[PDB]
Design a protein around this ligand. Structure first.
Ligand SMILES: [Mn+2]
Ligand SMILES: [Mn+2]
Ligand SMILES: [Mn+2]
Length: 296
């Protein structure tokens, strides 16, 4: 019926996990600034590229959480950005890829974090929130219930994680105070405690210690079913080939992945990383998925 090796199927790893487990309890791999994979200009890459492959590659590699950053256009649409850089990717584009993946692998669910990355273009009829809700969120693909969302209810749908203000529709995880460049704790959906490590602009050593500290707390609080842990291993670019997100990820990802591999924990949280690929081993996202062995 259900075996541990089932977690090895990167395209259906959530299948063996019971329907009653809250998404917050599952250890889920995610991608930081998910839509930056089409950047080609060397200068744009060194400063703003965080992924080498598209959404489907990311999903087929086990990623279930996507960090989508968008901008409202004068044509009532949302396109992806990284700062002032247009990424040649649209919100409709992401949703469509998620839909196809969910169709092929109905046992899974896609968690979509959405944040306003750049000021709306002048001439928009509505706001960032109103436009997203009216032209995108109305789609049945989006889960409309909240609370401590369970896997069973999320399968086959996209679970929204709001990082924008002004929301008016229900569904997914509500928006909450997200202080800049810090590790913090607060609540979400009234009955869910949330801890986030998002120090994106600290020195290398401080970042690694912060990742390990938050992961240590997660590994030791494995039965807390209503606590959500979001751990970003990504670091902002230094502008050179030695401190770009690519270089930072090449050293941080294997380091953290090795921690998990050696400890063999039962929970490591929602681990959001830069550059999901199969170059540097151990591979972080795979170890994160394997940490769900006790849920089976
Ligand atoms: Mn960024
Ligand atoms: Mn592709
Ligand atoms: Mn707690």
């Amino acid at each position: 019926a259900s075996s541990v090796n089932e977690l090895e199927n990167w395209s259906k790893w959530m299948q063996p996990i019971p329907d009653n487990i809250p998404l917050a309890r599952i250890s889920i791999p995610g991608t930081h600034d998910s839509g930056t994979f089409k950047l080609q200009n060397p200068i744009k890459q060194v400063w703003g590229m965080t992924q080498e492959y598209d959404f489907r590659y990311q999903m087929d590699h086990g990623a279930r959480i996507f960090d989508i950053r968008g901008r409202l256009t004068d044509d009532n649409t949302i396109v992806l950005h990284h700062g002032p850089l247009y990424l040649y990717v649209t919100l409709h584009e992401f949703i469509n890829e998620a839909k196809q993946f969910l169709k092929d692998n109905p046992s899974e669910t896609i968690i979509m974090s959405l944040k306003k990355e750049y000021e709306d273009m002048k001439g928009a009829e509505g706001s960032f929130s109103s436009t997203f809700e009216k032209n995108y969120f109305v789609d049945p693909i989006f889960l409309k219930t909240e609370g401590n969302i369970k896997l069973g209810d999320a399968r086959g749908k996209i679970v929204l994680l709001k990082r924008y203000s002004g929301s008016n529709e229900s569904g997914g995880y509500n928006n909450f105070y997200w202080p800049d460049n810090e590790t913090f704790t607060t609540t979400v959906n009234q009955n869910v405690n949330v801890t986030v490590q998002d120090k994106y602009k600290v020195n290398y050593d401080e970042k690694v210690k912060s990742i390990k500290d938050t992961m240590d707390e997660t590994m030791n609080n494995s039965e807390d079913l209503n606590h959500l842990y979001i751990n970003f291993t990504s670091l902002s670019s230094g502008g050179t080939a030695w401190n770009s997100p690519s270089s930072s990820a090449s050293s941080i990802n294997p380091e953290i992945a090795n921690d998990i591999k050696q400890k063999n924990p039962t929970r490591v949280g929602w681990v959001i990383q830069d550059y999901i690929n199969e170059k540097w081993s151990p591979l972080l996202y795979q170890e994160v998925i394997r940490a769900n062995k006790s849920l089976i």
